[PDB]
Structure formats: C-alpha cells, structure tokens
Design an enzyme around this catalytic site. Structure first.
Site: not given
Lengths: 41, 153, 153, 153
Positions: D30, D52, D104
């Site tokens: 992502h 992901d 992230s």
C-alpha cells in the site's frame, strides 16, 4: 531495370561502405590524438 | 586529491570509474555503468573502442577542474588509488597482489599531482603484477600498454 | 539570511535563484533549469512574460514557510545576498560592478525579515550599478522596475 | 543497528520504510512511491496483496548484514522506531497518539537485535494503541493482524 538497379545498388554500397570504412579508420587514427589534447598531431 | 575523479556505477553500486583530462572525460568501455555527475552524464561519449575506452569533451564550466596530463615517466613510484606503482622499462608495475576488479578508470599520478596513466586491468606474469593501462607516448600520442593476461578490472 | 530561497540549476551553473513568497514560487522566466529544491519542480508555473517572471502555488506541506513581500520602500539600505543595496531616488542601486550575472531571482529583503523586491539583472552608468527588479506598489500592485539597457543576470 | 533500514520516498516526503530480512527485501504494498536506494530499487518487486506487502531478492553483497528475523516473540517490550512497543495479548501496542502516517514499513525488533514484525497502522479504543502488524508464528509462518478499523499508515 535489374541491371540498372544493380548499378545503383553497387554504387551506393561502394560509396557508403567505403566512406564508412574511411570514417572508421579516420576516427580511430585520430583517437590516439583525440585522447592527447596536450600533444600536436 | 582524488576528488576530481568520479565513480561509475551499475545496479546502484560502483563498478568502475572515470576521469577528466584536458577537459575530456574518459571511462572504460568494458565498465557498463552510469556516471555520478549528471552534467558528466549529459556528455555524448565517443566510443574509442580501439582502447576499450570512451571519451567526451566536458563543458567549460569545469574547464579548470580537469586533470593535467604529463608524458614524462622517469622510472620510479607513481601515485595510485591504493598507493603507488613502480614504473620500469615502460611497464607500470604494481606491488604484486594489490588491486582488482571494480577499479578501472582510476588515474595514476605523478608526485606533482598530475595524471600520467589510467588503470584498465592487471595480472602477474611470474615476477610482478602488471597493470594494463592507457597512456601517452614520449611523443605525446596515446597508447595502450597491456601485458598479456592483464584482464580488465 | 536567504536560505529559504533556492538556486535554479542547468549545465552545472547556478544560473539563477528562486523565492517562495506569499505561498507562490517565483523565478525568472528568462532563466531555465532545475530548481535545486526538487519539491519546487513539482509546481506547474503560470507566466508573466512582460515581467520576465513566472509563478505557481507552492505545495501546502511547506507553504507556511514562505517569505512575505512588503509595501514599504523608503530609501535606505536593504539586506541583500551581496551584503546590502542602497535604495535611493526610488531605485535599487548597487556599487559599480559588484555581484551580477547569476543573481537572477535573488531576493532583496526588509530588515524586519520581509522581501521588498526580486532582482532580474543590472545596468550601470558608472556612478552606481542600477538594478532591474520587480517590486510592489503601496496598494499591492506588482511593478517591474528596469533601468534602461539593463542586462540580464 | 536498524540504522540501515531504508526509507521510502514520495514527493519528497518520507512516505514509508522498507527492510531486508534474511536477504529478502520486504516493504508494504500500500505504500506508494519508490525505495530511496537504487540497489534495492533494481529489485523486481512481487505483489503480496493479501499480506499488503511486496518482496524481492536483493544483491547478495548484503547477505552479511541483512536483518535477522526471529519468529519466537514472547510477550514483552520490543525495540521500535519511536523507542519501543509493548507486545501483549498477541497484539503489538503503543502509547496513545504516538507515530502515524509514514511509519508504515517500520520493523519491530528484539533488543538482542532480531527483527520480528512490521507496522501497518493502528487503533485506539479501550486499551493501549495497538498496531496493525504482520507477525511470525512459532511455526515460522508470516501472519498479518489488523486491529478493528486500523487505518493503513
């Protein structure tokens, strides 16, 4: 027409190929001088 | 000192080098790799394949920053990336065993800080590690000296 | 100081500079190249070719860091990248032959930490170097000032 | 340390991070943009949409320093970007309001120096702020966890 195109082809190959040969020879004959900016040819 | 030299890189890692002499950049042809300086990258290299090298004129904004060549080569130690090499009887001789792949394009320097040769590769024959290099003749014409087996680094 | 302003780059020349004023990027139009602050290059410019300037809204992520212009232009010294300039007779004036070509887009600042104008290039009669510059009217009218025959910097 | 962990960049912002575990590069799927390192950018990333993530194979030169993962993760404190994370009840958690977007891809690591997990987001209600995270069951199996409504950072 065949022999005329033969003449045209042969002349074009002769000129362009000999010119390419000469250009290559010139290029690499000057190259040892092109790499020698501090020397006189 | 060596700040005037520039690395050549492939896959994001250095795999060779290039140098500017008399305003002309040169890099080894065998070293596939991009050049760090983007302005150097903008120059159109001319493939001097007969010397396993390619060169191009760098613009005048770095006119003063080019290395100056010198053809005089009295027998003695000449500076190098890993130190110095003993020039003898026309051969650039490395103290055997030092150096290796990934170092082409490294200049070789006079104690006066002036470039005299460029590293192309190297090996040993039975007494010394010879380096294959490009250099200029006594008459100033450039020449390639490469004792057989001095494979490209 | 001026570090909140950045050079445009081409060929390796810091061929000019650009300023972030009022949340808009400003740079000389006659100067082309990469603005060194790469984030500024994401901006899409709008042009005012009569003023030889172009602008675009700086991204919000740093737009609050923009400099701000002034309505004030009383005669006197203003801090400049080459120390200061003397505003006199309603004109930006510099000593004969100082600074110069390469300063396109260089700001001129209010001592209070504000920008009074942006320079384009100079001229000089002999007594002083005259500056061509874009400035501001007391009611916010942006107006270019350019002594006759002013060269681009 | 985790010093060499690699930032991900997009529009100049640090929009994420990436890591190399056992020589296998891994970064969030992502997370848009590109890895700031060209050696890693050369990796042909492969999508892991259910997880992901996207993983490839790095140049083996870093086989000597790729981050050592460990699957076994008893409940307790673990090293993290913002100092440390508290691991309990099977879920990774942090103090309320710390960190956020762009974190992230930050890894989690045993204070002995072994990575164990990667952050994807988090949630706030009822307890410590838990992290959406991919984990490694003692079987050695990678498992993604998502606290209810965790936003993807």
């Amino acid at each position: 027409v065949i022999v005329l195109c033969g003449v045209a082809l042969a002349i074009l190959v002769g000129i362009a190929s000999s010119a390419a040969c000469i250009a290559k020879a010139r290029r690499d004959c000057l190259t040892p001088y092109a790499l020698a900016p501090n020397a006189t040819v | 000192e060596s700040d005037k030299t520039f690395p050549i890189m492939l896959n994001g890692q250095v795999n060779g080098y290039a140098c500017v002499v008399g305003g002309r950049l040169m890099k080894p042809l065998h070293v596939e790799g991009k050049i760090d300086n983007e302005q150097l990258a903008a120059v159109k290299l001319k493939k001097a394949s007969m010397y396993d090298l390619e060169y191009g004129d760098v613009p005048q904004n770095m006119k003063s920053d080019t290395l100056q060549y010198t053809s005089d080569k009295p027998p003695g130690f000449y500076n190098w990336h890993h130190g110095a090499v003993q020039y003898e009887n026309g051969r650039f001789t490395v103290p055997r065993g030092v150096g290796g792949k990934g170092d082409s394009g490294r200049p070789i320097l006079d104690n006066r800080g002036r470039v005299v040769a460029i590293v192309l590769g190297g090996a040993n024959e039975g007494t010394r590690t010879a380096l294959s290099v490009v250099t200029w003749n006594q008459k100033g014409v450039t020449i390639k000296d490469t004792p057989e087996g001095s494979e490209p680094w």
